[PDB]
């Protein structure tokens, strides 16, 4: 029911807005915790697999360097994705446990997904078939519709982002670049393949850049490469602002023409951006097979269920150089991150 | 192919935001 949506994203508003006027800090520390391996990682930093002390529970603890934020200008952008982090609620969406700060460091602690990056699980298997691929893409299509009621653009969808949990569902991580825009912003940011031409072009955008990277993602998960590729960046961006897409023979018809409406340079024609907003894409005839609530509900069974041992299994995840925690003596940038 | 292609391009692995 529409009306049942609508209460919902409002109610959703309401907490959201409690807890991004009042956001909770230093909810943990430091000596809570055993490193065990580094999982990832990003723009700002990596995350680390630890284990609580007390509780015996797992983590994925996303480590920043004060120092090395500051040296790199991402004073704003660090203290922002804790806020968001701490402030959203929604299932595919992970979750923040606790953080925290040092005299070094900051410490954003996330629920551990433990079945690894969707990218992982594509590149094995080459490419996913489209029932497969539209499991994942309805989950994405509802984690925006959350996000941009909120008025947040997320800006770095890419399969490296998406984690897949237990049950087989997605986890959205690292909101690095995601910002509370109601109207239009400005920075050049995101992963060049998923960039949308508006960002390309140095134009005013808005959150429709986030369903043109839904359109590259959809076409990355089912055929297993981007629509746009070239061995620079800067070729790529002139494919991208081209306007020409080529899609493999075994796409269905009903996937390129949601692909043709999703990567669409022109922003009056883009789907998503109409008057109808996220039901033009729900309502397409590619996903005319999706339950839009049992996928909500997590009720739908997942295509791929990923293989867990047990407490802090990382088999799904590939192996990365291991590096020193150090805490210095001397408290570094405190006034920077005070709102930490 | 575009699958050659792709795998030519180098940027296969995993890709940093900009
Ligand atoms: N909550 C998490 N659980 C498991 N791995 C994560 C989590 N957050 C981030 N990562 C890993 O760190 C990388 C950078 O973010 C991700 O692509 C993923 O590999
Ligand atoms: O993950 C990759 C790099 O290896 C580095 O971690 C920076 O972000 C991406 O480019």
């Known amino acids: 029911e529409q009306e049942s949506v609508k209460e919902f994203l409002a109610k959703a508003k309401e907490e959201f807005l409690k807890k991004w006027e009042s956001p909770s800090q230093n909810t943990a520390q430091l000596d809570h915790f055993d490193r065990i391996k580094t999982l990832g990682t990003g723009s700002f930093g990596r995350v680390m697999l630890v284990k609580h002390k007390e509780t015996g529970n797992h983590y994925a603890m996303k480590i920043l360097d004060k120092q090395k934020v500051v040296k790199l200008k991402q004073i704003e952008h660090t203290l922002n994705e804790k806020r968001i982090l701490q402030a959203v609620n929604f299932p595919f969406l992970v979750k923040l446990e606790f953080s925290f700060k040092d005299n070094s460091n900051l410490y954003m602690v996330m629920e551990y997904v433990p079945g690894g990056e969707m990218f992982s699980h594509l590149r094995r298997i080459g490419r996913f078939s489209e029932p497969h691929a539209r499991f994942y893409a309805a989950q994405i299509v509802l984690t925006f519709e959350y996000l941009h009621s909120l008025d947040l653009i997320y800006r770095d969808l890419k399969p490296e982002n998406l984690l897949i949990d237990q049950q087989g569902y997605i986890q959205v991580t690292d909101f690095g670049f995601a910002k509370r825009v109601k109207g239009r912003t400005w920075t050049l940011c995101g992963t060049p393949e998923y960039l949308a031409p508006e960002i390309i072009l140095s134009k005013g955008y808005n959150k429709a850049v986030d369903w043109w990277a839904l359109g590259v993602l959809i076409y990355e998960m089912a055929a297993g490469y981007p629509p746009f590729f070239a061995d620079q960046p800067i070729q790529i961006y002139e494919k991208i602002v081209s306007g020409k897409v080529r899609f493999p023979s075994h796409f269905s018809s009903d996937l390129k023409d949601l692909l043709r409406n999703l990567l669409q340079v022109d922003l009056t024609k883009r789907f998503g951006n109409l008057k109808n907003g996220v039901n033009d894409i729900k309502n397409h005839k590619w996903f005319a097979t999706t339950d839009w609530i049992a996928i909500y509900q997590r009720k739908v069974e997942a295509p791929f269920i990923p293989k867990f041992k047990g407490p802090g299994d990382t088999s799904n995840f590939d192996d990365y150089e291991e590096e020193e925690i150090r805490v210095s003596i001397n408290e570094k940038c405190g006034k920077e991150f005070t709102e930490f | ?18």
């Open chain 2, 1 to 18: 192919t575009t699958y050659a292609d792709f795998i030519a391009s180098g940027r296969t692995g995993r890709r940093s935001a900009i």
